[PDB]
Amino acid sequence: WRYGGDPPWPRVSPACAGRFQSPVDIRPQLAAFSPALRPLELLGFQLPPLPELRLRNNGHSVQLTLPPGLEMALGPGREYRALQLHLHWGAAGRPGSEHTVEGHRFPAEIHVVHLSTAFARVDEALGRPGGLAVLAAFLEEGPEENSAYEQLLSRLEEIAEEGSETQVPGLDISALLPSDFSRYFQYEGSLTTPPCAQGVIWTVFQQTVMLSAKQLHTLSDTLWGPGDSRLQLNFRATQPLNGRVIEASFP
Amino acid sequence: WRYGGDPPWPRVSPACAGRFQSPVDIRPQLAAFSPALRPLELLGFQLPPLPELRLRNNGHSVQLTLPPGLEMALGPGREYRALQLHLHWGAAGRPGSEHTVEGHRFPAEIHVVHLSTAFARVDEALGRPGGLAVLAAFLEEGPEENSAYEQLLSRLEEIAEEGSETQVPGLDISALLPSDFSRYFQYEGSLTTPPCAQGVIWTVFQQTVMLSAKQLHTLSDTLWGPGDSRLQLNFRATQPLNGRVIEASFP
Amino acid sequence: WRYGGDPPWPRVSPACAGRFQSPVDIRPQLAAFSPALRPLELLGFQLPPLPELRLRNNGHSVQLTLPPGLEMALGPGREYRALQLHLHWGAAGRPGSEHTVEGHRFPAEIHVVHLSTAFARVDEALGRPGGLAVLAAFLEEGPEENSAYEQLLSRLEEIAEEGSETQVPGLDISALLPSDFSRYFQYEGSLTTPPCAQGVIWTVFQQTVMLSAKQLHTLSDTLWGPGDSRLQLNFRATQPLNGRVIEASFP
Amino acid sequence: WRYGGDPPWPRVSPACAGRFQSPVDIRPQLAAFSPALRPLELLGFQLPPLPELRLRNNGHSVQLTLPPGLEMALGPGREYRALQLHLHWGAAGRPGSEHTVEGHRFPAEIHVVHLSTAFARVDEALGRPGGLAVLAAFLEEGPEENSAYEQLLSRLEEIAEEGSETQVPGLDISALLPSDFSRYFQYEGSLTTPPCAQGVIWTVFQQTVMLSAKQLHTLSDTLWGPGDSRLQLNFRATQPLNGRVIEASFP
Numbered sequence A, B, C, D: 001w002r003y004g005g006d007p008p009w010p011r012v013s014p015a016c017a018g019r020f021q022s023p024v025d026i027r028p029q030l031a032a033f034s035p036a037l038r039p040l041e042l043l044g045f046q047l048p049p050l051p052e053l054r055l056r057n058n059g060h061s062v063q064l065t066l067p068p069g070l071e072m073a074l075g076p077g078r079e080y081r082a083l084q085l086h087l088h089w090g091a092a093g094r095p096g097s098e099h100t101v102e103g104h105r106f107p108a109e110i111h112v113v114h115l116s117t118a119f120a121r122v123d124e125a126l127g128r129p130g131g132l133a134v135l136a137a138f139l140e141e142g143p144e145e146n147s148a149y150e151q152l153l154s155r156l157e158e159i160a161e162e163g164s165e166t167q168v169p170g171l172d173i174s175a176l177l178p179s180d181f182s183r184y185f186q187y188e189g190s191l192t193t194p195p196c197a198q199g200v201i202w203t204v205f206q207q208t209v210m211l212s213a214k215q216l217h218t219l220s221d222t223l224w225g226p227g228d229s230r231l232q233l234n235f236r237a238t239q240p241l242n243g244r245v246i247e248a249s250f251p
């Protein structure tokens, strides 16, 4: 499977033809303020340099494999463990986030994918209610260089080839995310690539992360994908809510 | 019986000349708003990949057989089980929906046919009020490839020949339907082919679903009907309301 | 089965414990105006004097059996034939209507019971959507002797014994009903006695029918029922709407 | 294990000492209104008289086994099938509900236990978030005999001895529940008996159901439990929220 071309995703994974897919257009007006949504809590995201982490160009994204012991709570009794994070991006002067807000697409997007602690294996969690959870943040152009992101972006040249990997020092994974953990949207959806399993809890931060224009250009211009092709515009088309209500943790 | 030339349908089925037939032209300004029309309830429609579903070219449409367990309600205690779905379509740049809206014919139309749970058999329900209910949705052209419809459309080549059939993976049947289950038109009418039985409750979604130009081309151009003849323009002409008022679930 | 005492009605017929029973309390402010509800049409209700009709004290009510050829339509394509009518009433100083309006119980009530023309036999219509329709009107005191009701009431003395019957000349049955057929409530419920079968379309007139004080006393004070007891208070307690929305033909 | 005596529940079943147990005390003023909570959908619950259903004294409660095809939804795509229902009650002069509201215990409580359709088997669903869902309604004292409850309460004398069982006619299960399906409290908790598995979505109806005092007495006073003693006060003490915020579908 690939972005742009065939095979059609429902041929690859039936679940990709579900009614409750991701990503979606967040319309803050139509969102339901729910005071029960408490601030997100992360434990163990401040990683030391060793052991090193695998960073891979899988031909679809750049993926950082995360070690054991990164814990995340969506609220009391809703506990998760981090597995991996990765990015979706555009091209030169073309934004490439997955989620939109009132039709606006942002330059890029970070996903941190988590497994519910009630499940030992991802294959048992797929398609089950609350089995996986993804934390998402928009990346926008800012004036300053983001130095947390520079640790990853400076390594992209080594994995320009599709299907290539390198090892990188551990870092503060939470410094790749916004500092406001109390203001977010939350909805139930799917993985935005095959196998497109539903039951996934998406938390989209309201605060954005700022990268420099150079950093954004490094992300979008360095990696190669299937064919003689650049790895760009690696985002799925917006998917209808189909009656789902996005909640918001703030009025 | 066939679409196109003879026989005239009142000769095969005299019920086709009844006073209360389908389809009809929907004129939203003349529809009667009733707040008693609640959102449609469709449960059990998210099918697993196995078992597989029979898909058949019957000469008149492409038809997907639905298993037990797809429950639908039009109101409190007014419950239904889905039997089958099928489609009506046009030809190259000629629309072939059955219902029209203020004279406008849409590219195509999906029908999900149901049996009242008050009747153990279809043949007891034929001609009895509310024995059969059909959910109808309009298919329009949009920019994106539609995932739910691709699962069906990619299999038509396998069944191009009149009378041929195949077996397809389970899919979310509800994904084939518009976003807002609270917005529809409703009236009583007939089956749109022989035997033209009356007492059918038609529910026509207000919102459409979108397929790509190529998807709509695949639908109209792949299947063959009776004779050495294409399966196309498989819609009945618009019938008079004869005093019936179409209702609306929305002001 | 009897009013007042045992056996409990669900043991006689399990449908008497359905969620969607009659009668109900009509709260006109919670009723949904639907302009699809047109004036009721009756045809054949003006009977010649011969053949005579049977008027029976069945222990629960006084019931008039109607002949063939009385036709009623709730709207275009919604056609019914009248089977019988009967009354429900209270006792001296106590109202006995079945339906209530904003908690007000009226002196008495008339029910005219019909079978959908889609069905040859009552037993096939029971529990089926729209299979049976009842027209209901409240009876109140006015200043004049009602001459249509007098033809029935003047014979009650003859059928005072439980299980007794008499022959009465045909009359204008529609003169037992209000002259305003355009203003009414309509909802879906049940028979108000065993078998308590659901799917029954109830139409309750806004306008009442007027009987003299003496006529109302004849109704409540002449007939005898099970035991050595008066046939009085022959109404079921108000049943909860349980989420059903009563419609009104007027704003 | 049993109600009243030894052993203490965390010895039989250490999950009973988990941090997120049920039942809880609902303080409506501290509940979080979330407008994403939509009306409950229950299809299939109107059962015919045959086949019959197993009703069983199990020493801890009276339990009705429900057949396949009772479908229930908490939200879009979030579907369940009903397994069984059972009751919790007090004794002569003392209430026996499990949940309390602002400290108030109600005479009794009904639980309808469901399995997520994302899981083929109950044993897969235990301890998994959303795996099981219970619908709970309080039973209060009212003036009238309840028709729906009488079908069960009248059959209790035939199963009075611990471990005995009977077959009952099919009944409308929805008729045992409150009128307004849009108004409920919801939180995540546990089974209220061993094995005390967590992950259970509890939905507690705002509105009560009403039973005659005779009916409540039949419930509390007819059944025999463990030892040679009565089956009564079969409720668990209220448990701490430990940070859980209870949600309400209504302001």
Ligand SMILES: Cc1cc(-c2ccc(S(N)(=O)=O)s2)cnc1-c1cccc2ncccc12
Pocket (backbone or CB within 6 Å): A083, A111, A113, A122, A123, A134, A190, A191, A192, A193, A194, A195
């Ligand atoms: C968790 C997972 C997510 C994904 C994703 C696809 C798309 C996303 S995104 N764009 O965040 O929704 S996440 C793919 N495969 C796996 C996966 C699938 C199967 C086994 C796995 N074992 C360990 C780690 C990951 C495994």
Ligand SMILES: Cc1cc(-c2ccc(S(N)(=O)=O)s2)cnc1-c1cccc2ncccc12
Pocket (backbone or CB within 6 Å): B083, B111, B113, B122, B123, B126, B134, B190, B191, B192, B193, B194, B195
């Ligand atoms: C359910 C049914 C729908 C249809 C349809 C004809 C036309 C439509 S459409 N365009 O939805 O109105 S649906 C035709 N025949 C049957 C049918 C008719 C008679 C007996 C049957 N027995 C088993 C299954 C189907 C039976």
Ligand SMILES: Cc1cc(-c2ccc(S(N)(=O)=O)s2)cnc1-c1cccc2ncccc12
Pocket (backbone or CB within 6 Å): C083, C111, C113, C122, C123, C134, C190, C191, C192, C193, C194, C195
């Ligand atoms: C139609 C019918 C109504 C009723 C009742 C009718 C109406 C009520 S009331 N209070 O109007 O709802 S109870 C009882 N039995 C039958 C009935 C049941 C079965 C066969 C019948 N054949 C002829 C006429 C009536 C038959």
Ligand SMILES: Cc1cc(-c2ccc(S(N)(=O)=O)s2)cnc1-c1cccc2ncccc12
Pocket (backbone or CB within 6 Å): D083, D111, D113, D122, D123, D126, D134, D190, D191, D192, D193, D194, D195
């Ligand atoms: C579904 C189920 C609920 C319960 C319940 C215990 C307590 C409740 S209550 N008070 O609703 O919370 S429900 C007990 N056993 C089963 C059950 C039923 C069937 C198979 C099972 N296998 C393993 C464990 C439990 C099984």
Ligand SMILES: [Zn+2]
Pocket (backbone or CB within 6 Å): A086, A087, A088, A111, A192
């Ligand atoms: Zn992603």
Ligand SMILES: [Zn+2]
Pocket (backbone or CB within 6 Å): B086, B087, B088, B111, B192
């Ligand atoms: Zn059709």
Ligand SMILES: [Zn+2]
Pocket (backbone or CB within 6 Å): C086, C087, C088, C111, C192
């Ligand atoms: Zn009656």
Ligand SMILES: [Zn+2]
Pocket (backbone or CB within 6 Å): D086, D087, D088, D111, D192
């Ligand atoms: Zn319980």
